[model samples]
Target chain A: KNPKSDKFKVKRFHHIEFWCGDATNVARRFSWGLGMRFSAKSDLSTGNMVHASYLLTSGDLRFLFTAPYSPSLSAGEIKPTTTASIPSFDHGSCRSFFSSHGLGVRAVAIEVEDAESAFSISVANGAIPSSPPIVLNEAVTIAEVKLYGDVVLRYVSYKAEFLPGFERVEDASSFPLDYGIRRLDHAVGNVPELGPALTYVAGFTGFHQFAESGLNSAVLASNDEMVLLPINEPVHGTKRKSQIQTYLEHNEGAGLQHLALMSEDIFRTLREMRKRSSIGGFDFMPSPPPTYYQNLKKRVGDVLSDDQIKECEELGILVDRDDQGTLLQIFTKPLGDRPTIFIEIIQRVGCMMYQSGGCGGFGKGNFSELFKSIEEYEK
Target chain B: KNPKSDKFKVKRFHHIEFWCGDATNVARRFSWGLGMRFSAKSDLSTGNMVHASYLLTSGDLRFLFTAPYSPSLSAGEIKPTTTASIPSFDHGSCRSFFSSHGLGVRAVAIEVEDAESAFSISVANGAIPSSPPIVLNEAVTIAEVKLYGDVVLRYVSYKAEFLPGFERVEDASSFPLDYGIRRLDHAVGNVPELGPALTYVAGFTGFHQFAESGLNSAVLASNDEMVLLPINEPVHGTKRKSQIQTYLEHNEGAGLQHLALMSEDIFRTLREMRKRSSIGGFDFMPSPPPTYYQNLKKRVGDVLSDDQIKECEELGILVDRDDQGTLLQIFTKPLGDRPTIFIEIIQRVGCMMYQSGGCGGFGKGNFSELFKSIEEYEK
Candidate 1:
C-alpha cells in the first residue's frame, strides 16, 4: 500500500493543545516529572480549559492548557481579548453535554511559530481562532494559539525554539509537588464504544502513529486488565493469554488510556515522588500493588538481590527489564472519571522491551488480587 | 408577595452540577463519612457511579453527574428492581453551558413517595419519566431516575424516608461518597458573575435567603477579599458583617459554591473524615488560619473561653454564635479546578443559626483566612 497526501493548504506540526482541568498544576507535575520547563505564559483565553493558557517548553516539545473556564464564553475563543479581532466563525461547537462529551473546546494545534499565520489560514478554511496571536513575551516567540469552533485544520510553518518556560503558568500554584518531566510523549482519548476515537483523533490531526507500535499493533487485555500494551513482537506472546479483549470488548472503542511523558532520569524522579508521597497531605499518590513486586521477583532472576527491588518499591518505581538496559516508569491514577487518560513517566536506560504485554507481569492472578482487595474495601 | 400555588408543581430547577476530577475516590470518602454501610460492588464495566446513586437516599436532594455516556446508561440512576414498572421517557432538552450557566439539565425536581404510584409527577406541564419505574425493595415505594439525552429526572415515592435512611443508608457500599460528603444540604452554581448565578438559582429553585442576620444574609464580598473568600456563612462566626458580598464579587457570578451535609455529630463525622482524608491523601485540614483564632480572642471577649474555642478547633468544627444557640460547621477545599463546589458538614445545636442568618460571632473570617492560605498554595 502506498500513502499519499497534499490535499489541503496547511502547515506542519505546531503543537498539540489540551484543556486541562488544572493547567498550572498539570504543567508543574509534568515539569517535575520530566524536567520539562515552561517557556512562556500567555494571557490568551480559549473560552475553554481556563482563563489563560501557559506555554510549556522542553527542548523541542510544546504543551499547554487551553485556559479552562466556566460557561465557556466562546468556543475556542475566549470573550474576545480585543474587539478588533472578533471570532470569525465557530469551528469548535459548544453543544450540549451529549453533543460535546461534556468536553469544552480544550484544544488548538499550531505548527511551531506559524500559529499566528496559521490562525488566519484556519479562519479562511472555515476554521476559527477564539483569540488572535498575542505575543506572550517579546523575549521569546510564544504567542496566543487557538482553533475556533469544532473542525480540523493544519499549520503553515514550523519554527523550533527553546520550548517554553514554566514560570508564568498559573497551574503551578494548584499543585503541591514540583514535577520534573522533560516532554509529553503521548496523550490518550476514548471515543464512542463502537466508534474509534483514536481514528478520529488521528484523522483530525495529521499525527501519524509509529506503525510498529501504533494502535493496530496494540494488544488489549479485557479479562481482568484494561491495558493497550503494544507488543514489540505481536506473535511472541500467547503462552497463557486470557483471551479477554479489554478496550475491544469492554471499552466501547478507541479512547485514551494514558499520556506518556519522557524523562531524563526516572530513578531520580521516582525518588522525589517518594518523598512527596511520604509528606502525606496531597491527594496525589502513585503506588502499584505489592503483588507486582512479588511477580517481578519471580520473573527477573534474583541476581540483583532483594535490596534493589526494595529500593524501587520504596520509590514506587517500576522497572522493565530486558537484555537491553532497564527502563524505569510509574503511573498516575486516571485524570478523571472515564479512566480514559492517565500519565506515565518513563526514562529509557537502554531497554527495547516496549513489548512484554502482560499485567506488568502480574499475570491473571494480579487482577484477581486487585479485585479481591477492592472487594475487601467495599465491605 | 402573594403565594402562587400550593401544588409546588416544581417544573424545573436545573442549576449546574459539579464534577470533581477524581469522583470515584471522592465517592469512597463520602461513603464512610455519611455512613453508607453496605457494599455490593458492581463491575467497573457497568460504569462507576451507577451503584453510588442507587444506594444514596436523599429526599428533596438529587444529584446528577453529567457523564459523557448514553442517556440509557446514565451514571447515577437508581434502577428499579424486578417488581417496579419501567420508566417511559428520559429525554430532557440539554442547554448550552453559557445558556444554562453550567446547569446542564433542562429541569430537575423532587419526587415524593406514593405507594400505588411509585413515580413522582413531572414538573413540566406534561413531561414523563424516561423508563419504567423499578422496584428497589419489598416495599411498593421506589424511585425512577433518568437522564434521557440531557433531561435528568428522578421519581421518588417515599414520605417517611426522604433522605431514605438515618445517618446510615442501606447497602451503604452501593452509594459511594464523592469525597466525604454524607448529606446534600445546598449547592451553589457559578455563572459568569456571582449575583446572576445566585439570582437564577433563587428564581428557579425554592431556595430562600438566610436574612435574619445581616451578616448571614448573602451579599457580595469586597473586591480585595473576594479572591480570598468567594462564599461565606456556614457554621463559622459573625464578628463579621458581610462575608457573602465578598464571595459574589470574587466568584464574579453564580456558580456552585459548596454543598453542606447534615451530620449527626460534627466531631465524630470529622474524625472519620480525617481518617479517610489522611489515608486517601486528601487535604481536608479543618482550620482556616491560626491567626483567625487569635483575632477572635480580641472580638468575642472570650464569651466561650479560649478553652472552648480550642475544644471546637480540636474537633474540626467551626462555631457560629448569634442570638440563638451556636452552629457548628466546617468546609473542604474546592473539589474541582474552578474552585466551584466544595463540601461542608454542619450539626445544628438547638438553633438554626445558618438558616437564621446568625452572623454575630461565627468563624466566617476563618473561612476567608483559610481560603487565603489555600489560595497562596495555588499561587
Candidate 2:
C-alpha cells in the first residue's frame, strides 16, 4: 500500500540536533569524547537569543546541541506533549521536549536536494508535518516532518558550508587526535512496536527493510543508500525488561536510541577512545565473556587477524561478518544522564563494492554479546 | 532588627551545587575548563536511581552538578516556583527549579560545626526551613533553609573524606594543569534590592555588613570571617538596564550570581587558565579600556610590580587594593546558556594578619573597569 520510492531522495545525513539543557557542556563532552571539532555555534553571543547551540563535526558527521534559554521567558511550566499539540519547534518548546527526553536526539536531519518536496512528499504519503519548508537563504531551505514521538525527520536542503545563522567557531578538540570517524552510518530509534514504525517510515521516506535481528528490530535504508535508520521495539516478555524498553521509559516515549558513526580505522579510533575512557571521558560497554574472545576467529571466520582479535578483546571492540564484508565496532556507554542514547563507532570494509554500501551485515554475530552487556550494565 | 551574632555558625563553603539538566557534561566542562578534578558521583550505576550527580573539587572549592532523571517515572510540567511552594527538595522538584533557573546555583552549601544546630538556629532566627536536618551516615548530617528565589542555604556537617553515598570518581582532568585554586573566597547573589536581602541574611547568619559600594552592593561576613556573602541589587536610574537587572530577568529571580574562586597564586592560576582559555574554555570578561592597564600603578598603587601590570594587561586580569591589602581578580563569561551566572577567579593577598582575614579589600578600585566591561559585553 505504501510507495516504493520517491523523487526527492536523501544524499546523506546533514546533521543530528540534540535538544539538551546544557548545550555548551554536552557539546564539549561529544567533542572531547568522540574527537570531533567544535565547529560552530548559535547563541546570544552570536546573536541567537532564544537558545544556546554548539555544532560539532568529524569529517561529514555533524551534531548540533541546542538548549532553550530559561526563556525569551523561564518563569514556569515547560509542558511536555506530543508533536502538533504545541504550536511548533520554538525555544521554550525545545525545553518542553528536552525536559522529557533528558539528552536524547531530537532531530535526525538528512541532506536532501529539495526540502520542499521531501517534506511535502512525506506528508502526502504518511508523515505528519512538524514545520513547513522555509527558505533560509538563497541556497538553504529547511523543513521538518514527524518521525517518532516528538522526534522530527528534518530535511535540510542546503549547500552552505553548514547552516545559516551559526557563527563559525573553529575550535579544535583539545585532545587533537584523529579518531578516524568519517560520517554517521546509521541512526537507531526505539519505539514500542517495529511493524508500525517500519510501515510509517517506508510510506513516508520510501526506506525499505535492509535487515533485522531477533525479528524485533528492522533496519531501513533509502534506495540511494544515503540514509540507514534502525527501528527497534522491546522484545517483550524476555528474561527481563529490554534495554529498548528502559530507553523508552526514561525518554518518556519513542526517540533515537544510538548513532553509528563510521570509522575509517577502528583500531586507531578505539585506541584513542580507550585512552580517554581509561581516564573516564565516558566509558564503553564492558567486554563480553571470555568465550566470545577465545572463539572470535572460529565464529567470524578468518576475516580478522589474530593480532586484531587480540586488540578487540583487549579494548572491548566487537566484530562480525557476512558474505558481503566485515564489520568492526564498539559501543560507548550512554553519553548523557539517562541511559537512553549512546554512540557506536563502526568501520565497514568492502561494503561499497558489494552494494551501495554497508558491506558488512549489521553485526548479527555480535548482537548476543551486545545484548548481554546491555542487560549487565542496564539494571 | 537583626542580632549581632549567633552561636551556630558556618565554618566555610562545603560546596556549591548547581541543579542542571546535564550534570555529566556540565561536570566535564567545569572539570576540563577550570581545572577541577571530577571527584565523585551517585546514579543508577551506583544503585542510586533517582537523579544523576557529579561532584567536582579543587582543594576546598567543591562544585556539585545535579540533574533530575527523566523521572523516577519525562512524561510534563516541571513547575518553577518559590522554595516554600515545593515539597522538600526531591528529584522532580530539582527539575522544576532547574527549568526556571537554567544553570544557576540551586544550593550554596556551608560547612558547619553542627548541622542540627545550624538548622535550628537559622530557622529560629528568621530563615525559612526547606528541609530538616537529616543524618546520612555516622559522619554526615545535612539540612537546608530557604534563601533568595529558589536557592537554598544547605547546611552540611561532615567528617567524611568528602560526602557519603557518592562513588569515588577520581577522574583526573585531561588537561593536567595545576590551576592553583585553593578555596571559595565568596559567593555573590543578585537580588532586586540590597536592603531586604541583607537584612534576611544578616538575621539568619549573624553576618554584619563588611563593606558597601555606591550604596548599591552590600558585602556581609560572619564575625569569624569563615563565610563571606555579597549581595547586589540592580541600581536604579542607570543609563540602561542594570546588568544585575539583566541577571534578574534572565534568571527569572534572585539566584547565586557568581562565585569568587580563590587562588593561591594569581599569576600561576591565570597563566594556566589563559592557556585553556586560549583554546576556548569559556572566555573571560573582555579586557577594560587601554587606560585601565595604562594607569594600573597610579590607580591601585605600586602593589603590583611593572611586569605584573604588563602580564595583567595581556591576560585581562584586574588589580585593586585598600589600606589593608591588595586584590587580584578576573571574571569569566556566563558558564551556562543564560547570562545570569559566571565565575570570578580572585586572589586575596593578605589582610589576614591585620584582621580575621580579607587582607585585600574587594575590588573597589577595579569596579568601574569591571562594570564597563560587563556593560559592554552584556548587551
Candidate 3:
C-alpha cells in the first residue's frame, strides 16, 4: 500500500444545484433527510430578476435551492382544465420543468485541499476562475468556473469559515460544528456521450481515472464500493436513448452526476442525529442513537465500544466497521428545487470497506421502520 | 354570462410527486410541510423494481415520495448533493436536481368528465399514454404520456383507480382511496428556450392559455383557486451552460415537468392525515400557527374567527378566504427516487374560483414563514 496514497482518504465531495419550481418544498425534503439546520436564506438580483435561494447545511455540506423566473407562455398555447374534480394532464407540462428548460442535472461542486492550486490548474485547463480566492483572516476561498456549464469547483477551510448563525464556536459545550467531513470521494457525472466532456473534467479538474478498470472500480473496497467513475457504456436493460438519449430528449445534459462524501465516524454521528429529534426539532450539534452503541461489541467483536458505542449512537449516526477498520457515514436528502443537490458526511476509522455486515444484519426491517415514519407525512 | 364556463368553474389540481435520494427524508418533508399524514410505505414493481415509495394525503391530493434503488447516478455525469444537505454551486456552475427521463409534468392536474374522449384527443395530437385506461365501476383510468426530448411525462390519470393495498376505505379512512382531488390546476414545466418548445407543450399537452399578466403566470384556475403554470427561462446574465441550460441543452429538446394537485377542503383533510400519524408530515401543516389565526378577522375586516382560523391552522393547511369564498391548499415534497414528481391539493369555497391570492396574501407572511422553514431544513 502506498503510504501517502489518496486511497481511503476522502479528497472531497462536490456541490450540486437544481432549478426547483418550489424552493420551499425542496427545503423541507432536505431537513427530513439530513440533520440539517437552517443557516441562511438570501435573495440576490432585482425585480423580475428570476432568482430566489435557500441555503442549508448538514455537518460540512451545503445545498442551495433556487427558482428563476421565466418568459410567459404564448397566447394560443396556455389553457385551463375543463372539469372540476377529475385529474388532468394539462396541469404541469414543460420541457425543463418550465418555459426555459426542464428540470435535471444542474452543476457539480467539489472541495479541494488547496484552493489556490486547484484554481490555477483549473484555469490553465480552460476552467475560468469564478471569483478570485477570498482569503478571510481565518480561511481562504478559491473556485474555478466552467464558462459554459453551471459547475463550480470550490475550496474552503472548514475550520476557519463560519456559515451564518453558528459562527462562534468556543468550546466542546459550545456546540460542535460537526467537522467530520475530511476529503473528497469520487464523483460520477452523467454526460451526453461521456467522451470529450468528461475527459475535459478529468484532465482539467485534476480528477484521476481508475483507467485500468474502465471506470468500474478505482480501488477494491468491499461489495462494489470500488469508487467507480463515469462510464461511456450504458448499464444493462437501459435503452441507449434512455441514458444520453434521455438527456437529449429532456434536459440538455452535462450536469451533476452524483457525489460520495467520506466520513471518519458515521455510526456515532448518525445515531446522535437520529436520537436528537423526531420531527420539528433542531438537529443535534452532532450525535448518534444509543441503540447503535449497544450492539457494537457483539457485532464488531471487541475492538472497541460498549460504552463508547452507546455514546455515539445517541447522535443519530451510522458506522461501517470494515476489515481495514471502521468508518462512520450518514447521507442527506437531495436539496434541489426539483429534488436534486444534496450532501453526505463521513468519518473514517481507517476502514477501506463499503459493506459493513452490521447494516445488512437488520435488513429491510430497519428501512421499513424508517419508511413508515415518513409514509404518514406523505398522506 | 357563462356560469358553468371554465372561467366561472374551478378547473382542477392534480397530484404532486417528489424525488428524493433517501426514502425516509422525503416522507418527513411532506408530513411536516402540508399537515399531511402519511398513509402507506411500500414498494411498487408494477413497472420498475428500483423504487421505494411513501404515499401521503392532504385533502384529495395524493402525494408521493420515491427513492430509487441502485444506479442513482446517471451513467456519465456529475451528480447533486442528496436531498438532506445545503447544495453549493460555484457561482456559474448549474446543477440539476431532477431526473432526465422518468415521470414528468409540473402543475395544474385537471379533471375530465370524459376520460376516454380526453385520451382520444390527447393521443390523436401526438400525446402518448403510459398505459391503456382501466375501467373500474364508475371510474376510468387513462393517462397521456408527454415526451419532451429526454424528460418524462409520468402519466396523469383522468380518473383514479386504487393501486392495490388500499382496499378498505373505512379501515384507512384518514388515508383514503380518494381524498377529494378534483382537478388539475396549472402544472408548471421548466422548458429549455421559452419560445417554440414552450408553446409546443401547450399544444401537445392540450392546456389552453390561462393568464397573460404578472411574472410568467400562465394562469389556469380551478372552481376555487388558480394553478399558475410558471416556466423559468435561462439566466441571461449568467454565462455558459447552467443546470437549467444543461437540462435544456442535454435534453436536446423539451419534456413533461412538474405536477401540482388542487383541492377544495385541504385543511380538514390535511389535519385528519396528521392525526392518523402518517410518516410524511406537513411542514406547513398546522397552518400559520394560532397566532396568525388570532389576527385573522382583524387583518381581513370582520372575516374569519379565532376558532375557525385556528381550526385551519392546526391542520397546517393553507387557507385563502376572499369575497368570492375560501380556498384551502397544501403541497407535498417530490416523488420518485430522483426527486422529480410531486402533488398539490386545493379546496375552493363560495365562489367557484382558483385563488391566485392562494400564493398567500401580500401581508400574510406565508412566503416568509415558508422560506424560514426551508432554511431550517437545508441548514
Candidate 4:
C-alpha cells in the first residue's frame, strides 16, 4: 500500500531479543551449546543500570538476551493524557512480562535501509506502534510495533557495532564455538488464528503468503527476498489439538515456536551438536522412528545415495525432497526451561520449487516425521 | 553450646536450592561450565506443572534450581490460622520471590541425623518455623526455618534417590563433564550485620564461631565437623565498604555470596576451567596483578617448587601457606546474570595451621588479591 515499499527493503532478520530471567546464563547456554559468541553487553557495569543485556552472534544470526532488574528504568515515554490502543512501555513492563511468562522471545527485529519509513508504513497499515523510531548516538536507529501477545516486531537500522550503550567485549570468554550455523533461515510463530496475523503481516510489511499447509501453517515472504516467516495456529472452537495449540497453552499466549538456522554442512553440524548434547548437556529433539527413515527412502528412492541416507539415519537427521532438490533438517528441544521456544538446523541442496502458498518447498517428507517425533516426545 | 548439639548434629551441606526465572538454562550453564550433572527433573512433562526444577550434583554437592510458572499451584498447605512468625508455604511465594530477587539462592539445606528434633531445637531457640517436618514417600523428611532476609535454612533427613516427585532423567543430554570438583568445602553468606547473623546461625544450629578477620569476615563451624560457613558484613557508618556490602546492595538483601568447592588438584582443575572458559564462554574473576605473584615468591621462595609456583602464576591461582602446609585457592566471577553468587575452587595440602579466629588459614594472601580482582571487574 505504501508507494515507497520498493525504495527501501526489509533485508533480513537483524536479531531476536528475549526477555529472560538470567541473561548471563542464557547467553552462556547459547554460546556453549549452540556455538554463538558473546559479542557485546549493556548492564550496570556498562552504565545501563535498568536491564542486563548480552548480544550473542553466530554468523549472520544475532540474539539479544535481556532482563529488567527494576521498574524505575524507562524505555520510552507514553503520553499520560493520550488514549492509545497499546499500553506504553518502561522497564517495568519487561519485568512484569518475564514474571508472568518466564523466558520467551520478546522481539523479532528486522534489518531495514530506512527504519523510520518502515515504522511509518507499518503503523499506517493498522499496526499498533509500541515505540516511535529513535536514533541512539551513531550506533543505530530502532523502532518497535506490537505483534501477537507481548511479542513485538522491531525495525533496526543496523550501522554500528551494536545498539547504543553496548560495547564490544574482547574478553577471552566471548570466544565463539564454530558449529557451522550460517544464518537464520526462517522463524516460526504460533498464534490463535492464522488469517488475521497473515493479513496483518502481509498488509503492513508488504510481504505475501508464499505457502500454506493443511495444518493451518502459512509462510510469508517479503517483496524482494531473504526474509521468510512461517506461522501456525490451532483450529478455533475445536476439541482437537495440534502442536501449535500445545505451544500457545504452554507459552501462555501466542509467541515464537522455533527458529530454523541454516547450516552449510548439516552433517557436520548434527555430529558436532550430538557431541555437544552428550558431553555438553544440551538437549536436541528426539529422533524419528526407524520406520520414518525407511519410509523416506521409499518416497525419495535413488534421489540420495545409500551412504547419504545412512548418515542421515545415524545422525537422526530428517530428509525431504521434491522433484527439484532435497533438504535436511533437525531440531533441538525447548531452548530454555519451558517447552516454548526451540531451534531447528536445516540445509538445502539444489534449487527448490516454490508453491503458491507454502514454504519455498520445505520438505513435506520431513514434516510428517517431525510431527510424529514431537508427539512421541509429548507422550 | 547445648549438649543436645551432639544429639542432632548438622552433618554437612546437603544441597542448595535457587529460586530462579529459568531453571533449565541455569542448570545447563552449571553443567557445561562447572561440570555438575543433571540428575533429575520435575516439570510439566513429568506431571509437576507448577514449577520446573532440575537437580544437579557433582559429588557431595547438589544444587536444586526451581522456577515457578504460576501462582495457582501449591507446594503444600500453609495453615493460615496458625501464627508462626514465618509466612506459610506454596509455589506462589517462590514465584513472587523470583520476581523480586531474580535468581538467587533460596534455601541452604543441611543433612541432619534427626529431622524432627532439629526443627524443634531451632524453633525453641528463637528460629522462626516455616514448615513442619514431612516425610516424602519413604524418601526423605524435610522442614524449613527462616534465616536472614528471606533466606531459609532447611533440615533434611537424607535417604532417597532424590526428594519425592522427581524422577531420575536418563536423557543423553544429562551427561556430566568431570572438572575435578569433589565436594562443597564451605558456603559464604553476606549480611548487613555479621554479629547478629553469626549469633543467629550458631545459637539455633549449635554451631560456633571458630574464626574471625578484621576485614569484617568470620567463619562458623558445626560442633562435629565438615559444616563450615564464612559470614561477612559491611562496616557501619563509614565510607569504607566490604565485598559483602557490595553483594548486599546488588543482591537487594542478604544472600549466599559464594560456595567453595573442594578440588583434588587445584592445578588440573584450573587448567580444565581455563579451557572451558575459553571454549564455553564462562567468566572467571580477573587475574591478580603480576606483582602479587612476585611477592608470593619472595614470601615463600623455598616453600614451593619453581615449576609449581610458575604453574600457579600462569593459571592465576593463589597460594597461602603457614609453617605447616599450603592451601591453593582461586575464585570465579559471579555465576548467574547478577553479581550476587559465584564459586571458589580450593585444595589444602598437609595440616595447615589455623588462625586464632580464621578459616584454618584460608590464605590471607588470597583474600587481599581476591578483593582487588573483584573490584577491578566491577569497575
lDDT for each candidate structure: 0.39, 0.75, 0.41, 0.73
Question: In terms of DockQ, which candidate is stronger, 2 or 4?
Answer: 4
Error of 3 at B249 (Å): 22
Off by over 4 Å in 3: A1-27, A40-53, A65-119, A122-216, A219-299, A306-325, A329-345, A350-379, B1-31, B37-45, B48-56, B63-113, B117-379
Top model number, DockQ:
4
lDDT of 2 by residue, B1-379 (tens): 2344755766878899888887877887677677777777777676555667788778888888887775544223342321111123486568778777888788898888899998999989999998888776577888899888888989989764566667786434333434798888889988998889989988887887775133268778776665788888887676666788889888888999899998888778777776665233667887776567766767665566788788888888888877767788899988877888999998876555434455576686676766665555454
Model 1 misplaced regions, further than 4 Å: A1-17, A20-215, A218-256, A262-306, A309-324, A328-335, A351-379, B1-44, B47-66, B70-99, B103-258, B262-303, B307-320, B328-379
Complex DockQ per candidate: 0.09, 0.43, 0.08, 0.52
Tens digits of per-residue lDDT for model 1, A1-379: 1132212333323454554433443444344333345555533222232244555565445665433344333334354442111122222332321133222224434334445654554355443335455442333332333321232232323343323223343443223233455544433343322124233323332223321111223222211121222221112244543212232222233334445555666666666644433121111334555655655676444434587777666766666654434555667644433433455666554323442222133122333444454455454
In candidate 2, what fraction of native interface contacts survive?
0.57
lDDT of 3 at A285: 28
TM-score of each: 0.52, 0.88, 0.45, 0.88
lDDT tens digits, residue span B303-351, model 3: 4566666666566555545444555566554332223334556555453
Model 2: CAPRI class: acceptable
- Residue-by-residue lDDT tens digits, candidate 2, A67-131: 77755442343533211111234865687787878888889999888889898888989898988
lDDT-best of 2 and 3: 2
Better of 1 and 4 by DockQ: 4
Worst 10 residues of 2 chain B by lDDT: B79-88
- Put down candidate 4 lDDT per residue, A1-379, tens digits, no spaces: 2133433487778898888878888877777777777898877777665678888888898988887654333334334421111122355677667766668888888899878888898888877888898766655778898877788888888664677667787766577577888888888888888899888877777776664223578877765446778888876555555667767767777888888888878988888777877555366777787676666667655667878888888988888766556678888888777777888888877654532212225665566666665666455
- Chain A TM-scores, per candidate, are 0.51, 0.88, 0.47, 0.85
lDDT tens digits, residue span B1-379, model 4: 2133532667778888888888888877777777778888877767665678888888777988887754433334345431111122355677667666667888888889877789999988878888888766656788898877777888888663777678788865477667788777887888888898987877787776553223577777776446777887876555555666667766778888888888767788788888788555356777776666666677667767878888888898887776556678888988766677888888877653432112335676666655655555455
Tens digits of per-residue lDDT, candidate 1, B314-356, equal 7555666556545567877544334434566765554342332
